[PDB]
Amino acid sequence: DALASVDGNNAHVEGSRAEDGEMKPTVIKSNVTQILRKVVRVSDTANTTA
Amino acid sequence: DALASVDGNNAHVEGSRAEDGEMKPTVIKSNVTQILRKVVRVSDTANTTA
């Protein structure tokens, strides 16, 4: 919700009222996860010795 | 029933997949009966003779 860059040169009289304020909303930024995987298969045949 | 015949070549690879195998069923032996009959007849006269 960064502020507004409408700084400008606002100058009004005292005996007056608002002129269409510019309230800005928020900004949503979303993301998504990622799957990681590691597999291991060992052959007990080649596992004869230690 | 009867166990599987001696294989001799029961050599399998290391870290391999379990083969489907082989399951032989049992044998149903069946027999039937036989009727034995012995007949005799004496005409009420040879039975009275001495």
Q: How far is A49 from chain B (nearest CA, A)?
A: 13
What amino acid occupies position A19?
E
- Using a CB–CB cutoff of 8 Å, tell me whether A45 touches chain B: yes
Distances (CA, A) of B17 to A19, A39, A44, B21: 79, 17, 12, 11
Q: How far is A36 from chain B (nearest CA, A)?
A: 26
Q: Are A41 and B14 in contact (CB under 8 A)?
A: no
- The structure's method of determination equals cryo-EM
State the resolution, in angstroms.
Answer: 3.5
Distances (CA, A) of A28 to A9, A17, A25, A46, B41: 30, 33, 10, 55, 117
Residue with tokens 């996860």: A33
